[PDB]
Ligand code: HEM
Ligand code: HEM
């Protein structure tokens with residue numbers, strides 16, 4: 001569970017992301033494609049080339065969802081219900097891949113927010129992504 | 142989330158275990174130690190030899206906790222508070238390991254309760270051990 | 283593999299007693315029922331709405347036999363699983379887009395089916411050797427992903 | 429360890445810029461703080477109650493430097509990690525009783541640390557080379573477990 005501290009940390013770090021969320025979302029994807037090639041099996045229909053608009057388009061969607069979970073940090077299960085349904089029933093992404101994306105998201109933020117990516121913030125962002133992942137995987141079985 | 146069918150299936154299967162839970166506890170540990178030798182890192186103080194009383198005793202301990210969990214299938218978080226604590230603040234077993242004991246527990250039930258280890262019961266028990274695992278690692282951070 | 287002649291012999295000898303037809307259908311069906319998300323690759327098989335529906339589905343049972351088939355033949359090249367599953371590895375990646383994690387879920391299901399079937403016979407030491415084979419198989423199959 | 433020559437050059441060029449003293453302390457400290465369960469091996473290190481207490485603890489800093497020290501040596505024998513790390517793998521198993529999953533967590537933290545420090549220089553492709561390396565090291569450190 002996220003503590004007040006955690007919540008503050010997350011809103012703060014995410015606050016800084018601002019308008020770059022989209023691009024950081026796309027970057028996290030690319031990192032993931034490159035470091036964990038097995039994740040690619042879920043996007044057989046995508047152009048995964050560098051600077052792919054499909055990836056850009058997708059990075060934005062993911063970032064909007066994370067931004068939505070931060071805005072509703074006290075009611076994520078409900079704020080993300082729809083996405084939880086989609087992932088459980090249509091996409092059916094194996095659970096292990098959530099941890100891989102989370103990781104690439106953390107690398108991306110670290111790479112962009114040196115002043116904010118403090119040990120305390122890092123810890124909070126990790127618990128947060130873990131929670132988002134848990135919600136998105138809650139209706140799997 | 143355990144459905145009512147699930148809760149039923151579980152209670153049934155565990156019902157058949159009866160006076161053998163302790164032996165099954167012990168057998169699951171032995172299978173874990175041999176199949177996943179990295180798990181032994183948490184028991185340096187034990188005699189991990191076949192038929193060791195330390196292992197038998199611990200086997201009972203674990204079995205008993207599962208029982209108590211089946212019994213409070215509806216209120217796990219509360220029935221296992223103390224255990225969640227112990228694991229999060231004292232034992233600090235890495236979360237990956239829970240998946241390993243859960244698996245050795247299925248294998249053990251399967252080998253002992255053939256008639257009862259139907260596909261639907263298999264699915265239920267898995268979910269159950271999963272929830273038990275979630276409960277025991279919920280206060281880690 | 284990093285199998286001991288002793289471990290090799292245990293694997294080998296239990297396998298001899300296996301009906302691949304039946305074990306194959308049961309392993310794959312159990313997979314589809316315990317981990318419902320693996321069904322994403324078998325929509326064309328039909329109704330997998332219930333365990334009953336999965337376990338009964340002939341398409342499933344038949345695919346299961348094909349899979350254990352290939353597995354079974356792999357047990358004869360235990361010293362080069364990599365080389366035995368190379369083409370199957372490419373196929374799974376490039377044509378089927380199957381996440382290698384699936385190979386590990388099945389392996390574990392396989393082990394539960396063997397225990398189910400052999401009871402007593404499937405001892406801790408024997409499970410241990412099988413765990414090494416299923417991991418070895420999954421690794422071999424995932425080897426060509428890029 | 430499928431490091432393409434170009435992947436190996438990239439690992440090496442960046443490692444040239446690292447202050448192991450510094451990175452070592454940050455990686456270890458951050459592990460102890462993001463995954464507090466890992467603190468189980470350091471009860472003689474004193475106060476690890478808060479991130480400040482962890483990050484600043486002279487013992488953590490000194491140990492981190494030792495760890496990264498051994499890791500750097502590893503980077504000069506990318507060809508023989510198993511050999512390089514053999515006595516260390518035995519020690520972690522037999523004396524320290526360290527669950528190998530610990531090696532993977534540190535690898536990930538380390539990658540985040542490198543990203544933290546190098547910013548834009550830690551490109552997608554450079555991260556991918558480092559991912560193979562931390563995994564190769566973790567595997568080498570776990571090779572003698574039994
Ligand atoms: C916290 C992590 C994640 C978030 C916030 C997230 C969110 C989303 C969103 C917002 C969409 C688009 C839905 C729409 O069409 O409106 C989506 C689609 C999708 N996601 Fe997830 N997702 C996450 C994890 C994953 C992972 C780990 C994978 C696989 C590696 C994955 C695979 C997919 C796929 C294949 C689609 C459909 C894309 C398309 O065809 O356009 N997702 N996700
Ligand atoms: C299925 C989930 C598990 C349950 C229900 C469970 C239950 C228990 C119980 C009842 C105890 C004894 C408490 C006491 O001594 O009063 C215990 C202790 C312990 N558990 Fe957990 N456990 C689980 C998973 C694990 C796993 C996976 C590991 C490590 C691989 C582990 C490591 C330990 C250790 C090292 C002890 C203390 C042993 C001793 O010194 O006596 N547990 N657990």
Ligand code: HEM
Nearest residue numbers: 320323324348349350352353370378380384385388419423
């Ligand atoms: C023990 C590991 C596995 C082995 C040895 C294996 C082997 C095979 C073989 C021999 C084929 C025949 C296809 C051909 O030659 O054209 C096949 C097809 C296929 N496999 Fe795998 N497989 C394994 C695991 C899996 C898993 C776990 C899944 C998904 C849950 C999967 C999904 C498929 C699919 C979707 C096909 C295509 C069948 C069709 O054309 O309808 N496989 N596999």
Ligand code: HEM
Nearest residue numbers: 466469470494495496498499516524526530531534565569
């Ligand atoms: C890159 C991975 C690692 C490397 C290269 C490494 C290297 C080392 C070295 C060189 C030593 C000193 C050897 C000696 O005392 O003779 C050591 C000790 C130790 N390592 Fe590791 N280590 C690694 C990861 C870890 C992790 C992740 C943990 C725990 C989470 C850990 C726990 C320990 C402990 C507890 C000691 C003994 C400290 C003491 O003197 O009390 N190591 N390690």
